[PDB]
A paper describes a structure:
The flagellar filament is composed of the protein flagellin that assembles into linear protofilaments. The 11 flagellar protofilaments twist into a supercoil that can vary in rise and handedness, a phenomenon termed polymorphism. Each protofilament can exist in the so-called L- or R-state, depending on the conformation of its composing flagellin monomers. Kurthia is a Gram-positive bacterium belonging to the Firmicute phylum.
We analyzed wild-type, mostly curved flagellar filaments projecting from motile Kurthia bacteria by transmission cryo-electron microscopy. Helical reconstruction resulted in a map with a maximum resolution of 2.6 Å or better of the most ordered parts and an overall resolution of 2.8 Å (EMD-10362). A comparison of the 3D structure of flagellin from Kurthia (276 amino acids) and the published structures of L- and R-conformations of B. subtilis (304 amino acids) show that all share the same overall fold, including five helices and two β-hairpins, but that the loops before and after the β-hairpins were shorter in Kurthia. Kurthia flagellin was present in a conformation that was most like the L-state as encountered in B. subtilis. Initially, five 3D classes were identified, which upon helical refinement (including the refinement of the helical parameters) produced good quality potential maps that were so similar that combining the five classes significantly increased the resolution. This suggested that flagellin was essentially present in a single conformation, in which the 11 protofilaments were tilted slightly left by ~ 0.06°. The electron scattering potential map of the functional Kurthia filament showed six extra densities corresponding to O-glycosylations of threonines and serines. Our data indicate that wild-type Kurthia flagellin was present in just one single conformation, and formed nearly parallel protofilaments, irrespective of flagellar curvature. This suggests that in Kurthia, the polymorphic switching of the flagellar supercoil from left- to right-handed and vice versa, as induced by reversal of the flagellar motor, might not require a conformational change of the flagellin monomers.
Author numbering:
A (entry chain A): 1 to 56
B (entry chain L): 57 to 221
C (entry chain Q): 112 to 221
D (entry chain G): 167 to 221
E (entry chain F): 57 to 166
F (entry chain A): 222 to 276
The structure:
Amino acid sequence: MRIQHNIAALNTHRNLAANNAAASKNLEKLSSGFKINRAGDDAAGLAISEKMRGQI
Amino acid sequence: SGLNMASKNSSDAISLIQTAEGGLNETHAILQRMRELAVQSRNDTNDEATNDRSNLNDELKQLQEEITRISSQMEFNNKKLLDGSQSTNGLTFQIGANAGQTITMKISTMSATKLGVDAAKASISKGTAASKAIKSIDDAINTVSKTRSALGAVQNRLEHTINNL
Amino acid sequence: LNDELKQLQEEITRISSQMEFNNKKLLDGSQSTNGLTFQIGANAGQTITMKISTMSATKLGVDAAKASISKGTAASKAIKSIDDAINTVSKTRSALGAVQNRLEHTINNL
Amino acid sequence: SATKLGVDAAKASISKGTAASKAIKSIDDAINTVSKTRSALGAVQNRLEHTINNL
Amino acid sequence: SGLNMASKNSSDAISLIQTAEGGLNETHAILQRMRELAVQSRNDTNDEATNDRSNLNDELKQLQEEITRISSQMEFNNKKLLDGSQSTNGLTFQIGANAGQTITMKISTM
Amino acid sequence: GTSAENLTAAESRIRDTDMAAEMMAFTKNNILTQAAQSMLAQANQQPQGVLQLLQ
């Protein structure tokens, strides 16, 4: 309730970690120049891109 | 304590999955290169006599050794992933404090023999063999795309799991 | 995309039947039969009853047996099915938040 | 070397008109062989590039 | 989310349509060439004996093989367009967030 | 050539990213990170009730 646990700081830490992760993802997308670097980014579209690259 | 440790374990699983996906990206790349080589070999401007296609076959054989090498030299914490070790039973991640709160996962063998692109069935010595090699390479590209999708789905699931935890 | 969808359906079921407070499953249908009773008063009978519905994929008509996206046609129904599910879970969240806001005033009065 | 490729002076002189006939074919064979070797090297180079990316 | 994805889908449809139009531009071109060949063949200066018109027929047959080739070797994402595949039911584009906000399209055999 | 250009455009629109949107998102996320940092610095100082005990 008072000392042993400070829940506001925990919530703030969570949100801070999430924001840092999102900024890192954006940095990856900007440095790479591609919007899809992993399949977790977009599954339907990775396959399409690979087939289109083969066709090109 | 269980929930925090499960968050840690989920992050570890995400790291493993990222390793496997990064392994398969180069498989995609060299498969594209192999398809380009086959489409070039397929034309009749090239002569078997003066060794025009045997150089593209040199290139193709080296890329096949590399596609096998990436398969059976990939590891996370001394654990071979893309060989068929996990295709028998599967990797189990504890994503919960209590017992039974698990998820099972499986990764298939991604060598040249399994995908029908090894040199015993995908040579480009001839003009005829390149015809089959093109289709064989397309099938392999589609299969490895499918596997990458299967990995990314579990990654995206684990993210939501971490948030909930 | 169906791989992705199936994994998300396993997760929506997992959150339902792996949620607990003090070894008490909440989002399964355990409390939908009789309900949780909170004593918010010194004397007997000064209680409030509460109920939480089953929030699995089967109850909301979004499980894989009725929400595949293998075809183009099935995605048409899946969109509407997902909208209905979102509205239902919003309704349930509202029902919970109302009781929370009530309990705050109750604490002040106590 | 020239000895291995059959183009050394002991077998590829052009003193005569006849010897140049054989010298032309000998030089063609040597060009093809060294092209083959260059291809063999370039393949390993291209492999090592992908290896570096994966690493 | 639905509106942004519908924008993406509409752009994809535009790409497909551009592919088909680019395919038909060369059909126009070789049809013009074939008409020129026929108008030249039509005159009586040319002899069937010494193979004057059979060479224009060689040219014409090759251009007919090309007009068929463009038809049944055109594709977008492994989807034959100018064969009659879509002339039976048609391609449906989702250009809206909700269900039913679609447009159907059809392409004939060329 | 026409087909290659069209498919290249399609693949670019599918996979490549727009620099402006990602720049926007990155700036937004940095600002949010700074805000959360300041909020945490405040929240760590919030529990100071030592003046109850001593004097």
